[model samples]
Each structure stands twice: as structure tokens, then as C-alpha cells.
Target chain A: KVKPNPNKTVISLSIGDPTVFGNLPTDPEVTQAMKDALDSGKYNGYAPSIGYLSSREEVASYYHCPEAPLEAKDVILTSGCSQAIELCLAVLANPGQNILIPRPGFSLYRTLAESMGIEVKLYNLLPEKSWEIDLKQLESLIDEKTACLVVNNPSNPCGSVFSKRHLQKILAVAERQCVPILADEIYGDMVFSDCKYEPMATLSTNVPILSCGGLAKRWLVPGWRLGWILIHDRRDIFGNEIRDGLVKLSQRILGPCTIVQGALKSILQRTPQEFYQDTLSFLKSNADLCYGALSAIPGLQPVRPSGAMYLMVGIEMEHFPEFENDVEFTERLIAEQSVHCLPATCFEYPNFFRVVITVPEVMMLEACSRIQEFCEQHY
Target chain B: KVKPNPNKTVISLSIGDPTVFGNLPTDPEVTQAMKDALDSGKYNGYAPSIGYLSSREEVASYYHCPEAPLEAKDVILTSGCSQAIELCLAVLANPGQNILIPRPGFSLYRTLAESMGIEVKLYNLLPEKSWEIDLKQLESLIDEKTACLVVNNPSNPCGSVFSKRHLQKILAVAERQCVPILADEIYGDMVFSDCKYEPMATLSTNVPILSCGGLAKRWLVPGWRLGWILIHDRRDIFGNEIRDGLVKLSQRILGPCTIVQGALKSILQRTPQEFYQDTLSFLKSNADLCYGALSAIPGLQPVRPSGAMYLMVGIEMEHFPEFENDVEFTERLIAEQSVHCLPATCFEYPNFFRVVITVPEVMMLEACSRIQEFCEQHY
Candidate 1:
């Protein structure tokens, strides 16, 4: 219960939250829709665990299926992407079994799996090649006890969108390994120019894929907590065993937030393509600005983000005499420059840092300048 | 997916959900508060794992007392009581460890614990003793591997309210054994009598008590997936180890629904005593009418419910040659008649059935009459 430091002004790039009261104010239509639903008084009871029928159908309809239109039955709406991940983890991995996760990706999945007494094996996401999955390493890591492999695209920290070919390769590896694939595509719609974002489910029917999505990122409404876990095995190849497990798990867990269910229909249905385009346009500009600014700095390797709202940069420890690692550098930066960025250690990567330009166009510029000043002063 | 029964219209009382329609809903203020919060264009990001500060403070304030005043720090808001129980179970018991659960309590806990490779030891809830905990049996059954004991007061299916003395003795046993008590008082405020409900935490501070509550039962709003897990230890003896474990478990799972958090302040702040009075009046009338109707049946023994929304009726099988057990009877009842009631086997009781009176007044009478007609016709 420490009080906020009134004197110290800070700009935080540490957390992945879209900056409120800045560039990412909630869409007015989404806000109005929420308000309208509340005033209507038709909602406020228990919804089915899977989801409301309209909400599920809306999400399914958003997918690019012309003839083979998706139905509500294909969707199991959850509290958020995190809950979606947790449900998948709970069902897929038994104790003593492991789930393959990317090293230095979002750590919640690994933490969650480990808490369930499930072993977590980290296969590298190749930073040298736009943070692509190290397929050979991933293939080598899989064993008979491996239950699932988690892929995040566009990646959380590195912001690398998986190409269609890369996803196909991963699907092939999963098929060979006989393990399910958990594709976390929370940031699916945040791809930059020239980067085509393809859902892994669209690419493969060979492996069981649980494709997760939410309004948190692309819709710019993380507080909604309305997300879904889509069972995307078109042929029902995984069969009743997995589906039954999911239904039982849902029943046992009760259901997701009911108010969020009220918003789900409107969120999935009426949100214009411009909302996503606006977010991508803003993120692309910010990434460019950050890259240009960081490129000018010495002894730092900035990864050119193709998509997502984050950038991970490697910091050369030798250049900064005062700091031993990225964590110390970050603390010092926060203290001296009033600039907050997460140390790479938080993401399981040493000598690297993760930053998200979620602030307004102006604050992002200020944040970038502060980062530059802090680096220059230290180096 | 089994096809819907085309010949008969289904009337489900198996699940404990509200049978109220879409129109006459829970408080408008609660939903309006949520809507207003969303419309303010604030709180559109991930909240703290525990909960929102204002909402937590509201919960603490509402449950505050001089003897055991709960603070915001003492509360961990969860995604309904289900996740709260899940978190408590994970933290309290590891594999090979056992926990005592009341037989014929909510079976979701048993399912969850077993799924996680944890063993559940059932202590009997005596039907003859008005569904009171078999304290003597509970003491004899507990051993070194017994980590914790769970009690659902204002009991779920049986509708038994734990007397203050009963709670005191239970707490004394738990305190003596040096084990924590997990109190699922989700239906705490739904007591229908003059008997003042005493929270276990209010009576004792010697043993660690985790009391789980939500706005569901008290407010008749189960869909609002917001609940609180309050640590009622004033001595802070249980804080060091248990609190941290619970926190980690909560973090591992997705936290409570955010919109539920938004509604907490409003839901807790209002909800007049008259609301509960009116609901309880309806339930009491229904309970009386159903009990009278069942008493007329030669083979049925219906216990008068002291609390909750259900009546546990003992069905004598000597009269019916076709049905062997409660399951068969329940199946036949649903198949032959459109009425649906849960078999006692679902709650681990062999010869009883839990009939809920959650439907409107007319439907409740019709259901009771139908059950009476079915019994007489069979006899």
C-alpha cells in the first residue's frame, strides 16, 4: 500500500495495456453498445458455459468461411484469452505431461501449466529470422508425454507474425508428434503493412488446433474479458474424447462473465474493419518511430516488428558500465529518466527488454526520447 | 450431441440456475453501473489479479465487523465461487493428500479435485439430523493426510442452515486438528428463517477460514461471475504460507470476470432487504406447498427446507418395482413426465432426489402436483 510518488512523472512502456485517456480510448460505439445493453435489462442471468448463441455465432461468422460457415457450436466463449488458455491447459495436459511453449514468450501459459503440476518445455522462437519457430529444435523437444505446443502470433514481445508456410510446417510437426496445438492469436488482427496474417486453423486440418481470440487487442478492449476457445478440427479428427473433456471442464467451472456475454454479440458483429485498421496504422507508425530512434543508439539490436504492439531489443551489457543486466538498466532508467520498460528477464530473456508503444503519438515520441537519453547518459 | 426429445417438452431442475425469464432480471442498477463504467471509456484494460480496488473495498466494507472486519487486503475477488473453490483446492491439497467434503454437496468440487489427481474423502451429512454435518464422524474420518475440510452452509441441495453451535463445534474440531476450513457460504444470505446466520470466520480466529461468497444467490444473479475469497484470520498466522499459495493459484487461473468487478460496488451497495424478503417469501410458500403435496404421497419423505432453493426428498423404493434407485426414478420421471429433477446419485446420495422450486409460483405448484400424480399412478 505504498502511495503514488506525486513528484515523479513517468511514462511506462512496461505493461501491454493499451494506454487509456491517451491514443486508445475505447471505441465510442462499443461503449454505447455496452451502455445500451445494460439499460435494456434483458441480460443479467447465467449464460451457457460455451457462450450465448448469438455471440458465438457472431464470432464464428467473423471467420473467412464462405460455404462452410461456422456455427455457434464451434465456439466456447471464455472470460478472456487467459481463461481460454487455462481451460485448454487444464484439458490437454495431465500431470507429469508437458506442454511446449516458446522461450521468452508470454510467461502466463508456462506459469499456469507448471501450477497444474504439468511440466513446461521451452523451444526457442528464432530471433534471427523474425522470431520464427525453431522447427527443428521444436521437433527435437517433443516427446510421447508432450501434450500440446503453444504458438503466439503475432508474437507478444517480438511482434512476429507467423507466415502461412511457417504455420503449415508447425502443423506438420504437431501432426507427426500427435500433440494438439494451442494457437494464441489475441493479436491476430494487428499485423503491419505487407504482413498477411493467416489463422493456423485455416491452414491445417491435420492437427487439433484450439484457436483463441478476444476483443482485448484487435478490438482495443482488454477490460471486456470476452474471449473464446474455438475447436477448429474441421473433420472432428480429435473426436469425442477432447470435446467431452472440454464440456465437462466447462460445466465444472460454471461459466464466463455474464455481462461480457451481453457485449459479445455487439463486439463481434458491428465492429468495423476500420477499428483494426486504425490500430494497425497507429502501431506500424509507432514501430517505425521506435525502430528509427533505437537504430541511432549504440550497442542495441532492435528487432523490426512486423506486427503486434511490442518490440524486444537486445542490450549489450558491456556498453553500460553501471548496470550488470537488463533488469538493473531498467530500474535505473525508471529512477533516472522516469521511463518505465520491462526488463527482458520478465520474459525469460536476459540482456533484453520488452517495450510497448501504447501511449499517444506524442507520449510515444517522448518515451522514445527518454529511452534514448537514458541509454546515452549510461553508455 | 444427443437429439432433443421430440415427443416431450423438457423441464430441467437438474442445474441450480434461475428459471426466470430474460425480461424480469436482476437489479438494473448493477448492470447500469457496469455500463456506465464502460461508457466512461475507462477500465478497459486488465485488472489486478485480486480485483479492482473500489470493488474490493466495497466487498470489505459490506462484510466488515468489529470482531472480524474484512479489509480489501483480506479479500481476493475471483471469477465466481467455482474458481475460488478451485484455487482453494489447489492450494490446500497436493496429490496424495485428502480433503473432506460433505456428501451430497455440490459435486463440482469432487469432480475438479479428482480430475487434478487429488483424492476427496467424503464425510456424511446426516439426513436424520436435518442434514447437519456428522461432527463425530468428521472427527473420526480426518487424519494426517487430511489437508482441509469444506462446508457449504445454507447447504445447496439439502437446504440446511448450519446452526451457530454447529459452526462453533466444526471450527473447534478444525482448530484442534490444525487444519484450515474452506467455507463455501455462497448462499449465506439466503436463509429463510429468524435464525441469524453466523459466519464461521465471525465465530473463530484460531483456525484459518477461507469464506467464499458471490452476488449470485443472495442477489439471485448467478451469471455475475464475481465472487470473493476472504481470509478471515486476524492473527495473520495463516497469511505467510496460505495467502501466497492462494495468490499464485489465482494468478495461474484467469482471475474474476472484469464486468463482474464493475458491478460489485453497485451490487453490494444496494439490494434492499425487501428483495431477499420477497424472494424468500416466494420460496417459503413454494417449499410449504410442495412439502404438503409430497407428504400426501405414500412413499416420499420431503424434509422442510430451512434455507437454499431445493428440498431433498427421500424416496422409498418398496412401492415401485420398476425403479431400483434414485437415478432410475429420476430418469423415469423426466421421460414419462416433462418434469425434471436431479437424482441424488449426482450428489452421491443413493436414495434421495433434490427437487428445486426455482421456477415461478404456478410452475412450482404444477411440478409438485405432477410428482404427486406420478407417485400415485405408480403405486
Candidate 2:
């Protein structure tokens, strides 16, 4: 429903892509690895349906820990984290079965599930508590027909990172309900605050957790379309059938680009830590800048983001009498200020809009200033 | 069912990959285009759901014809031809509906359809007539519940290329029955002999055709996972709903790797004609060699393939007392000769096996000689 005004020079904060504003440069070593793979000419043919063993081994080794370890057998590389999520749903839920998803969350969860005739039931994520899962509501929604629950850490749109304790509690609920967890850790370890990201799989001993992740966000190459599903079954809850089912499903579309698979081992093992630290530092500064700018503007209340690259700004609809709703507010902002942010309704939340905090500092400043001007004119 | 012997040097004719056995070299320009795309770093973010506009335009232009032309709007890029077929089935068929497929065809067609809960009805392909469609049987399989009919031209396993007149009659059956055609032309224009590959869409004026193709086979880069579905609706039969449904389905997994999509235009347009000419010549020679070798070996029959990289080889079970079926023959051949070929039952045809004709000449000769030795010993 949101479109840029052609007459105006637009500053788009609507897309979460870091490459759009040139703030993030993909590490040189990753690109070199891809070139090397191509030059070797070994990866020009089909990769195994589950993916190259070396690539899967790299992911497994990277995620290995004392709490819940992963093996190469448990990993299945996919086209992207989106496909990772889609495969988990397809394997767990049959037609007419329902999956629990978080509200004010990623919209793609609903899109992927509902397309296959599987129903999605939304559980509330409390904005008043920094967008934590409403534990009571979440547990109440779990019924006999609930196949699995989806939890996105360092969540999209809200940009709130969960603590280890919070993730443990969520797993407890999943264990109690005997439902598995599809942990969308695509934003895993992207936190920019005091909170350390906890992989949900590490906290659960009894719950079967399918941790879905990718290099898209961490490596800043979403277009590479490389992601994976790592099964963490410490208690052997899923058994061999679910694991085999995943392999069978993966055979249908095959894996990601072979060149990407060829490059993945190096990308996973060799990318310097500083690249991630610097990106986090930059995102933190932008998040601070965005929060400060919104705090100064009248009729704007932004939930200060602690992680990820987005901040959700709640609009005081009563003060902005010229606007009918969040969509109308976004439309007017785009028309008058030429700044585009997605209406929160797009994320299943109303009266708010989401802004990506990865635009260049100067552009971010100008966009905030324009928003201030538009607010003053409307008010 | 076939596995190569570890003790001896193995020759693999079981796989359809053109990159294997070093018969087909990916055009340097295609590889250079991909490397250049990665080096530019502009395509590091997500592509649009349909695809990169330029890639789609290239595909559309490549398929354009005076009888049934195409535009960029008619193209939707996919992960591979497999996914192109998957998307067509997802959009066209509902659960409980059946799709018509050719017997002794690509097993992936049935795998993709049946996985989504769609039933598959196998129609006969007359191998006696060079594997042309049994048009009468095909028409009989069409009913109200038949969502679509799948036709793979320059077909896999059978390696038979349909004549223009034969393709026209197939289209007529589709038109008369009002069943849309999912024409898989992944091997389009790869014919080795006098056969001219006719796109099903180009021959039909009334039938709705979605032609699926990719750079995997022709460009010899199957691992790139770049493919497309071109909608050829000369009669406007599909209208907008089906087209929109395709877009919705594509949004689930997104398109192929962004860098690959970025490079697709040049790969499609700039790869030298000599590359294809050389590849066709090599495959033609291999086909001839295989046919000649099989003609001399008693109890073995090979359909002389005019297109694609494979030839269907029939085994006379009565003559080979040591082998019970195609599977047993393949197993024994791999163990005894250290040569591998796929059982024809894998493609829904019993007592036959499929062989790739792109193996090195020396290896192919040795493998064929080994097969003759095994047959002589068994006789």
C-alpha cells in the first residue's frame, strides 16, 4: 500500500536492506571466497540436495556449544532463511493444522504458512514490556492442533532482543505443550545492546527446536540466498522420521546456489569479528539518533530498539488530527516530507510505523528533520 | 539403486549434469558476468519477488516469437526449472486435483506435484514412435479434476525431441480439453541432430502455456540455480488471477541468488554461439558412439537420442540370466564394470536404464566395452 512520491526526492526507511544506503560493505574475504569457488570450477554443477557436506559441517561447528550441540547430519542448507522457515512449517504442519506466530512480528511467517493451507494463530507480543512474548497468551493459544510455535529473536520491526531467561521460559512453554519450536534466529547475534542473544535451542533440553539462520543479515549479503535449518534434538524428541522428512522436502527444490555453498565454509569461518562489531556499533549509533529524533518530535513515541536494525514508532493519533490512521500518516509523511516508512499494520500492528535505522547518518538526520517539519505543519 | 565400485576407477553416466565428465565448459563470459556482479556489490540485497527486471526481460526476449511473443511482465524467475514447475503446480492445482504427466519422464515432475498433495496421472509416451506423446491417451486423462498437464520437451531420460507437428498436436489436445500446459523446456534448443525444438507456447494460439526453462543445462551451470517461467497467453485464457497467483507463490521463497540474476542478462545474450555448437557436436558424437556400442551388444537396446544429454537403454531381461530387472542390471554393472547408470524404473519405466552421453570419449568407450564384457560373461 506504500509507494514513493515521484515528484519528490524520496528517503526510504521502509526497506530493512542495509545495502540500499551503502552503510554496510560486504566483507572482501567473502566475495573472494566466491570468486575462488568459481575459478576452481568444482561447484559449477548440482550440489547435494541437503547441501555440500563441508558447508553443513561449517554451520554445525559454528553453532556447537556445551548446552546443545549441532552435528552435520542435523543441518540442511536452504535458499534463504525464508525458505528455512517455509520448510520447517511444511514438515511440521499438514493442511488444517495451525501454527502459532508472534504478533507485531515478521509478516512472512503468515505468508509462508497460509499459502500451503496451514492456518496461523497469532499470539501477542507485549509492547509495554519491550515486545516480550505475552507468556500467558502464548501458552493459552497452544492447543492439540498446534503443530509448532515460531519465535524470532532480535525480532524484525520491533527490534527487541530476548534474554536467555526469556528464551528458556518460551521453551518451557513449548515443552509443556509438547509442541516443537521453529526458532527464527535469522537475526541471531545481531544485538547492539547490553543484552546477549540466546539461541532458543540452547535453552531447551526436551523441546525439539529447529534453529533457522543465514549469512544474509550477519554477512550483509541477503541476495546470496544462503540459509539453513539446524535441528537441535538433545532429547531425541523428533526421532529419525522428522529428520528424514526434512531431507525429502529439501530434495524438491534442491539447495541454494552452488557457488554460495562453495563459499559458505570460508564465509562462516573466516569473516573477522571486527566486521560484525563495527556494523553493530554503526546500528547502535543510528538507533540512538533515531530515538533522540523521535523523542523530540511531538506526537511520536518510539520503542527504543536495542538490537536489529529497525525501530517501531507509535503515533499519537489523537494529536495528529490530520491523519486518519498509521497508513494515512505514512502517506502524508511520504507526500509532504518525502520520507517513507512502513505502516505498522504491515507487521500486524496498528497506529505505528517501522523505520530501518541503517541509513547514512546525514540522510538519517535530514529524514528526521523533514519528519519534524511535516509534524509541525500537520499539528 | 546404482553405486560405483570403490576399488576401481568409476565412470558416471547416471547424472544429467553437463558439467560432469568435463564435456561442457561454462562459457567464460557467463562466469565473468557472475564474478563482475559480485565485485560490483550492488546486488548484495534482496531482489524483487518476481526477479531482477533485466533478467526477466532477457528471458522474455529470448523466448519472443512472431506467432506468440513475450514481454518482461510475462516472466517470473525461479530457483531452477524444478521450482518453476513447482510454482506452476502450486498456482494451477489444488490439493485433491490431479496433474497429467508423461510416463518415463522426469521423476521430479511427479515428486513436486505429489509432495503438495496433488495426484499425478501418468499418460503413455510411445517409445516406438521416438517417445512422442500418445495424444489419444493424453486427451482421455484430461477431465474436470485435471488441473494441468506437464510436458517436458527435449525430454529427460527418454532424450527424445518432439517434432514441430507433434508438438502442435499435443497443444491441440490441451486446447480441446481446456487444460493448461506446463511445458518444461529446460533442454530447449539443445537438440543435437535435425530436430528443431519448438516451444509449446509458440505452436498454440488458444491453449494457456507456461513454458519453464533455465540456464542450468544450456549454459552448463546448474548450480547457479537460475531459471524462469514465461507465461505465453495468446488467447488471454489465464487472465490476471493466475498471473497474480504466480507472483504470490514466488513471494514465499523469493527469487534465485541476486548476483546470478544480475548476471543472467549477459549470460543469456552474450554467451558465444560456438559454445553451444561445440557442445551439441560433442553430445551428437557421444550419442552415435553409444548407439553403435549398444547395437553390437546382444540383449541391449538404446533409443538414438536426437536431443538432450541422455539416452534410454532397454535391457532384454530374457538374455541376461544374471540380472532380474533394470535395477539389478544397474547394480551389477556398477559393481562389475565400475560404471553407473540410472534404472529406468526411476523414471517410471521398468527393464530400462538411462545413460548420459556427455562422458569423456575414452571413459565412455571403456564403460561400453565393460558392459559388453559383462553381457558376454552372463550370456
Candidate 3:
């Protein structure tokens, strides 16, 4: 639904892809890993549906923690983090059963769940409270038919990373109801500041966690379509029923491309810390730049993002009587400024729009300049 | 469950992957296509969930025919043919409905269908009739609840390519029942030519066809995991409802790797015909070699393959009193001769086994020699 004005060379802050702009190309070592794998031809045959063992081993090592230990057996390689999310939803809830999701969240959870006839219960995320889960509202939504709670860290759109203590509080809510957790950590560790992204598994003692993630966002290669699920259960709550369901389910597509999987071992080991550090460094500057500028504009309240690559700017829609709603407010911005951003209603929030920080520095500056002019005229 | 024998340097005729043996390496051009995609770094971002349009245009032309024209719009690129088949079953049938699949067929149909809670009705593919459908039995299996008929050409295990006339007869059966067709043509046009392969689309009149295929078998790159679905319905039967259903379903995984999708145009067009010709030429020789060797042996009936990389052989269990069933027959083959082939029961067809003809000639010869010697002792 996000589109650009036809007459202009649009500066799109709409796309989630970091690689869309030339500035954020993947490291040569990472690209080389894919090159070597393709060149070898040895990896051109079918990999196990759960993925090649060595590939999973690397993911395990990178994400492994004493509190939420993962082994090769606990992983299922998928097409992307999107598929990882879909699989967790498929395995956890039968049709008619409900699952708790965050309001103003990634809409894929709602779409994926609803398509399967699974009821999706949206709990409020307090935008007023740094977009933290409204713990009381979240607990209230749980019932006997509740299959699980989906928790996202450094969440999409909001770019709000969850605190360890906040995650523990959410886990305590799920634990009391004896529901499992489908933790979407696709933005896992893609943080910029004070609060580090804590995987729900690391904070849970009794709650079973199926942490879904991949090379998509973190590795800056969403096009590679390589992702995975890490099952963490210290108390064996999931035992084999849920674990085997994921294994059986993966047999449908047989998993992701083996070329990328072949590169996985090398990509995990050889890609330097600077590659990650540079992207985060660039993103933080963009966030700071946008936040500082947008906050000063009348009729706009821009929230400073702690993690991920977005800054959500709230619009005082009432001040702009010419526009109908958030959709119209953003649409007019697109028409006048030629800067396209996703209206927050796409994530079930109103009076706000999401600004992607993945755009190049010049483009970001120009987009903000345009936005200021457009808002000044409208307000 | 197919494994290599430890005691001897096992000559396996079990794997579906042609690239397992070094002699059957993918065309250098095909490998280069992938290399260029990886090196360009331009294609490292997310492609459309249905695939890149240009990548799909190549597929459209490759399969487009006078009887069934195609556009990039009609195609949906997938992880592989496995996902292609899964999507067809998912979109065609709601759970609790039934789908008709071929007996002595790829077990993936059954597994994929059953997992979705869709009931599977297996109609026999008469082995004596070059593995053509038992048309009467197929029609009898169709009830109002039947969602679709799944047809496989040059079928897996059987390697029996359908005749143009036979396909017409099959289409007649589906038209009468008002059931659409899910054509599993992953082995499309892979015939060993006294009979040329005709797509089901080429023969159908009013019947809608979802022809599923990929680069897995023909291009010798199952691990690259690129496949597609070509919707063939000239009568405007599937117009948008079913087409949009596939669009919705593909959103779950967001399709396959873009690196492969990026290389798809070149891989589809530039991989020389000689590359495919040489593969079939090698497979035919291996088929002829094993057919010539094993046909002389008693208690085994080898059906000369017309296409694909498999030969279905019937075993008279009455001739081998020592073995309890097909499982034991294949297990004993593994233990005694250090050879491995999938037992027929794996495809729900008892007293028969499938031999993969994609192996190196030397290995095929050795495996056949071992099988004959082992059978001679038993007989």
C-alpha cells in the first residue's frame, strides 16, 4: 500500500531492505562465502530439510548462551525469518485457538495466523511507555485456548528493544498461563544503544521458547532467503511434539537454498565485526539525525528509536484538517515531498508513520528537509 | 532412510540428486550464472514473494505453448517443486477435503497433503500400462469433496512419461468430475525420447492446470532450490481467486533465494541444450545398461524407463522366502550387495523398488552387477 508520487524521483523511506541503497553492501568476505560455495559445486545437492549440520552449528555458536542453550538438533533452517514465523504459528496453534500478538506489531503474525483460521488476540504495546508491552492487557488476553505469545525484540516499525526485566515480566505472564512463546528475534541484536536486545529464552526458566531469526536483517542479505528457528526448552515443556512438528513441516519445501547454506559456515565465521559495527553506526547516526530534525517540526512528535532501523513519527492529524486520517496524511507527504513512508496504520497504529533509517545519508537528509517543508505548509 | 553401505565402497542408485556423482556436474554456465548473481551484490535484497518478474518470464517462455499460453503473471516462483506442489495442494483444498494423487508416485504428495489435514485418495498408476492412470479408478475416487487431481509426468520412481493421447484421456476424466489438475511436472520434458514429453497444459481443453516444476532435476541443482508454478487456465476458471490464493500462500515463506532468482534468467536460457541432452544421454545409457543386465535375472521385472532418472523394478517376494517384505528385500540388498535403492512401499507400491539412474555409469554398472549376483544366489 506504500507508494511514491509518479512525477518525482522518489526518496523512499518505505523499504525495509538495507541493501536497496548502494551504501549498505554486504562485506566482501560474506559475499565471498557465497562465491566459494557456488564455485565448489559440492554444495549444489539437496541439504537436509533442517539444513546442513555445519550451518546450524555456526548459528548455534553465534546465538548460544548458557541460559538458553541451542544445539544442532534444536534448529530448523527456513526460507527466511518470515517462514520461521509462519512455521512457529502453524505448529503452536490449531484452527480456532488463539495466540497473543503485540498491537502495532509486524502484521505478518496477524496475516499468517488468520489465514490458518487461528484467532489472533492483539495486546496493546504502550507507545506512551517506550512501546513496551502493556503487561496487564497482554495477560488479560490469555485464555485456555491461547496457544502462545509472540514477542518481538527491537520491534519492526517501533524500533523499541525490550529490556531483560521487561521480557522477564512478559515471560512470567506466559508461565502463569502455561503457554509457550514464539519469540521473533529477526531483529536479534540489531541494536544501537543503552538497552541490549534480550532473547526471550535467556530470560525464561520454565517457559518454552521457539526463537525465529535469520541472516536476513542482521547479515543485510534478506534476498538470500536464509533463516532458522532455535528451540530452547530447559524444562522439556515442548519435549518432542512441537519439535517434531517443525521437522515434519519443513519437509514441504525441503528448506532454503543450499548455496547460501553452504556459505553459512564461512559467513558466520569470517564476516568481520566491523561489517556489523559499521551498519549499526550508520543507522544510529541516521536515527539521531531524523529524531533531532523531526522533533523540532510543529505538529510532529518523533520518537527516538533505541534499536533496529526505524523512527516512528507521530502526526497531529487534528491540526491538518485537510487530511482524513493517517493514510491521507502520509499520502499527502508522498505527493508533496516525494518521500514515501509506511503509515503506522499498516501496523495497526494511527496518527504515525514509520521512517526507515536504512536510506543513504543524503537521501535521509533530503527526505527530512522535504518532510519539514510539507508539514510546515499543511500545519 | 536411504544410506550408503559401510562395508564396501557403495555404488548408490538411491539419491534423487544428479550432482551426487562427480561426472554429472552442473553446466559451468549454470554455475557461473549463480556466481555472477552473488558477485554483482545488486540482487542481495528481497525479491517479490512470487519471485522477480523477469526470472518468471524465462519460465513462462520455457513452458508456454500454443494450447496454453503463459505470461510472467501466470507464474509463481518457489523454493523448489516441493514447495510448488505444497502450494497447489494448500490453495486447492481446504482441510477435510480430499485430493487424488497417484499411487506408486512421489510420497511427498501424500506427506504434504496429510500434514495439511487434507485427506489423500491414492488412485493407481497401472505399471503394466506404462504407468498411465487407471482412468476408471481415478474417476471412481472423485466425490464432490474432491478438490483436485494431481498428475505427474515422467513420474518419480516410475520414470513413465505420459503419452499425449493418454493425457487427453486423463484430462477427460478430470473434466467429467469437475476437478482441476495439479500437474507435478518437475521432470518436465525430461523424456528419453521414443516419446516426447507434452505438458498437461498442451492437451487440456477446459480443465485448469497448475504445472509445478523447477531447476532441481533438469538443471542438476536441487540444492539451489529454485522452482515454479505455471497456472494454465485459458477458460478463465482460476482467473483471480485461485491465483490470488497462491499469492497469499507464497507470502508465508516469501519464495526462494533471490541470488538463485537473480541467476534464474541465465540459468533458464543460457544453460545449453547439450547440457540437458548429455544428462539424458547418460541417463538413457545407464537405464539401458541396468535394464539389459537386470532383465535377464529371474524374480525381478525391470520396466524400461522412458524418461526421468529412475526405473521401477518389481520384485516377486515369493521367490525370496528369506525376506519378509519389501523393506527386508531392500535392507538385504544394502547388507549383501552394498547397494541401496528405495523400496516400493515408500511410494505405497509393494513388491517393487526404484533405481535412480542419475549415478555415474561405472557406479550404475557395479550396482547392477551386485544386484544380479545377489538375486542369482537367492533364486
- Name the top TM-score candidate: 2
Q: Which ranges in model 1 have alpha carbons more than 4 Å from their true place?
A: A1-8, A39-42, A66-71, A169-179, A234-237, B1-11, B22-24, B234-236
Misplaced by over 4 Å in model 2 are A1-8, A377-379, B1-8
Work out the TM-score per prediction: 0.93, 0.96, 0.95
Ranking by TM-score: 2, 3, 1
Docking class of 2: high
TM-score of 1: 0.93
Off by over 4 Å in 3: A1-8, A195-197, B1-11
TM-score of 3: 0.95
| Residue lDDT tens for model 3, B1-379 | 5454566787667778877767788899998988887878879887889998888888788777677888889999998888898888888888789988888889888878888789889999887878878877887998878998888887998988888898899988877788889988898878875777788888888999999988888888888888899999868888898889999888877888898888888887788888888888888898998888888788888988899889898888777888777788888788767888788898999888899887877877878878888887875
Which residue pairs come into collision in candidate 2? none
> Tens-digit lDDT track for model 2 on B1-379?
5456677788788987778756587889988988988888878897888998877888788888888789989999999998899888989988899888888889888887787889899998787889888877887877778998888888898988988898888877886788888899999999978866677787888889898998898998988898999898877789897899999879888989988988887787788999889989988988989889987898888888889989888898877887788888888888878888898997999999999988888877888998898788875
- What DockQ does predicted model 3 obtain? 0.83
The number of residue pairs in model 3 that clash at the backbone is 0
Tell the DockQ for candidate 2: 0.84
Shift of residue A365 alpha carbon in model 3, Å = 2.3
Here, model 3's chain A TM-score works out at 0.96
Chain A TM-score for each of the predictions: 0.93, 0.97, 0.96
Model 1, residue A378: displacement in angstroms? 3.2
